[PDB]
Every structure is written in structure tokens, then in C-alpha cells.
């Protein structure tokens, strides 16, 4: 394994980003806020908050060399990034220490200049040096042999705004007011015992999630410390609600994280607030009932849309709850691990 970093184009330099430094974390926020993923028509761009990036990028076992930035030599402007975080991954009959690759991003001015290939080779090298030789990642780009392919679905919470910014459109013979009526939700959840997750809930959430994930073919394997990190509620980042039965025992939970998108060209609407279905576990509450209450809670918290993939058991509630299929397709890839492809309903892994 090569011990020196791979050579960058002249005028560019490697810099590991200290996300515990507020200035540097804002530098990464700015890079992603201005250059990260857009929709096909360049109307929306992800707007990961600084506090979200710190949550996504420093889970248990994070390493500083795995927060891999590129800067302009003369000005020190941040112009490239890629990240890896450790994760224990179950894939069919095997559970293996891998990394999750995320947030690959090159400044718009620097594209088509073969920087992203180097970012990928360098993070690969830095992961190899830790003895880890597999990775999981997702992308919209179709690379060869995805282990799985999921599609986005969208549940309109604020339909007028979505239609106005052209995130959505009126269906045939539909009108604005009739669409608002169609997507109307109850104002309070209906499941008895539903409440935000607390510290005391960490062990039961861990046990519930570990037993529930076993039925899928690609899942995380989380310690209790990782459960605490990924699920303990943090306002405007991660929401988790547990169902406590009449004897005081948690039987189900739901979770969704906060990922808004900049709206580039609308005279009045500047941001699209989206909720992303994370992990949802049911053993006593029907999943349909669980997700109906997820929609209600997201609506209450001012989200404009609730987003979900067709993975795990989601297809059992997507249409019944008036999700509309999106135009986006998400491929899951495993690096240096051959195995058969699987349907979306056997994928049990959600990245940020």
C-alpha cells in the first residue's frame, strides 16, 4: 500500500478537515451548499446543515484522515471533499468491517479536470492503511453490478408549496385546493404510547433494530454506542419516536432525518424542508400505522415533503399512504466484494 498521498494537479493540495473546528466545518458546509448534488433540472440543491455533517461524519470510530479535503494552494479555498466512516456491514452470510463512502464533491469550477478520480484513489489508500478492504456506497450514476437499485418515493406534506416550486405538479383534472385536501393529514399521531426516544430507550432500540434487520441481505450491524449516535434525537438533524406499550415497554420505533434543499429560482420560496425515512421497526404496531404517524409528526415539524426509498418493507405502505414515486434512482455498490444482486426489499441499509 502506497504510503504517500497520490499526486494532485499542480496548484492543489490535500488537507484533512478538522470538523471540530467551527470555521472548517462551515467551509465544508459552504462547499456542499454551493456544489453538492442537484436534481436533474438544477432547481434544487442539497443543503446539509453544519450540525448534520458533524453528526454524519463523526460517528463512533471516525478518523480524521478520512475527512479528506482538497484546497487551492494559493488561496486555501476548499474545492474538493470525500469521506469514509467505519461501519460493520452484514452482506448475506458475512458480517465485515467496512467503510461507508459519502459526500464526494468537487467545486463546479474544478470539474472535468480529473480531481474526483484522485479523491477516490486517495480515500481508498487511506482506508487500506487501516486494514479495511471493502466499502459500501450509493450513487445515482449507473456503475457496473450494483448490489441493489432503489427508487425514491415522496409524500406531499405541503402540496401547494411543492407545486409552486415545481417539486410536484397537479395531476390530471386536479386543482390546487383539491390537491391540498387530498394530502391533508391528521393533526396528532394516533398510536397510543408514541413519544420521542430517550436515553433509557437505547438498549431496547438496539435490540429491536438488531432483530428486525436480520431479515434483509444488506444491513448495518450497530453497537449500542452506534445506536445512541444514529438515533438519539437531535433537533433539526435526527428524529426518533418510540412506541411504549401499556406496560411501559418499547415495542416499535420510527425515525427520520432532516435534509432540506435550496430552491434556486423561485421569487418567494428559498428552501424545501424534506424528511427522510431512516429506520422503522414494528413488532406490535402495524407498519402502516407507524408511518402514518411519521407523516403526521413531520407535518407538525414543518416539513414540506416526506421522502422514502422502496427498500426494506416500505413497498407495503408507500402507495396506501399516498407516496408518489420520484424520478430518482439510487444504486447501492459494494467495493471489492462480489455477491448476487438483490431486490430493493432485501436492502436494509440507509446512508445519510
Amino acid at each position: 500500500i502506497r504510503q504517500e498521498p497520490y499526486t494532485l494537479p499542480q496548484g492543489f493540495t490535500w488537507d484533512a478537515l478538522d470538523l471540530g473546528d467551527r470555521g472548517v466545518l462551515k467551509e465544508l458546509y459552504t462547499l456542499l451548499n454551493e456544489n453538492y448534488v442537484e436534481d436533474d433540472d438544477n432547481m434544487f440543491r442539497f443543503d446539509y446543515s453544519p450540525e448534520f455533517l458533524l453528526w454524519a461524519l463523526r460517528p463512533p470510530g471516525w478518523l480524521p484522515q478520512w475527512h479528506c479535503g482538497v484546497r487551492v494552494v494559493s488561496s486555501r479555498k476548499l474545492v474538493g471533499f470525500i469521506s469514509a466512516i467505519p461501519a460493520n456491514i452484514h452482506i448475506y452470510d458475512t458480517e465485515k468491517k467496512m467503510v461507508e463512502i459519502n459526500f464526494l464533491c468537487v467545486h463546479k469550477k474544478l470539474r472535468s479536470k480529473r480531481v474526483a478520480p484522485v479523491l477516490i484513489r486517495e480515500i481508498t489508500r487511506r482506508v487500506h492503511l487501516e486494514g479495511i478492504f471493502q466499502a459500501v456506497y450509493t450513487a445515482g450514476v449507473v456503475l457496473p453490478k450494483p448490489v441493489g437499485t432503489c427508487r425514491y418515493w415522496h409524500r406531499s406534506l405541503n402540496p401547494r408549496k411543492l407545486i409552486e416550486v415545481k417539486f410536484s405538479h397537479l395531476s390530471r383534472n386536479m386543482t390546487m385546493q383539491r390537491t391540498m385536501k387530498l394530502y391533508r393529514l391528521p393533526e396528532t399521531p394516533k398510536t397510543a404510547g408514541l413519544r420521542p426516544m430517550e436515553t433509557k430507550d437505547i438498549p431496547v432500540v438496539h435490540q429491536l433494530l438488531t432483530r428486525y434487520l436480520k431479515q434483509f441481505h444488506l444491513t448495518p450491524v450497530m453497537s449500542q454506542e452506534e445506536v445512541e449516535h444514529w438515533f438519539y434525537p437531535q433537533e433539526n438533524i435526527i428524529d426518533t419516536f418510540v412506541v411504549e406499550n401499556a406496560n411501559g415497554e418499547v415495542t416499535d420505533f420510527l425515525s427520520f432525518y432532516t435534509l432540506p434543499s435550496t430552491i434556486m429560482n423561485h421569487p418567494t420560496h428559498k428552501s424545501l424542508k424534506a424528511a427522510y425515512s431512516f429506520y422503522n421497526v414494528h413488532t406490535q404496531t402495524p407498519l402502516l400505522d407507524l408511518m402514518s404517524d411519521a407523516l403526521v409528526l413531520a407535518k407538525m415539524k414543518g416539513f414540506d415533503v416526506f421522502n422514502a426509498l422502496d427498500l426494506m418493507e416500505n413497498k407495503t405502505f408507500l402507495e396506501k399512504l399516498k407516496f408518489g414515486i420520484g424520478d430518482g434512482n439510487l444504486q447501492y455498490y459494494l467495493y471489492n466484494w462480489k455477491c448476487p444482486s438483490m431486490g430493493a426489499e432485501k436492502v436494509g441499509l440507509v446512508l445519510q
Binding site: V37, G140, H154, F167, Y276, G324, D327, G328, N329
Partner: peptide
């Protein structure tokens, strides 16, 4: 997170 999808 990797794809900014909208309604189809």
C-alpha cells in the same frame, strides 16, 4: 442523500 429526486 445521493440523489435529489422529485415527484415523477
Amino acid at each position: 442523500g445521493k440523489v435529489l429526486s422529485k415527484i415523477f
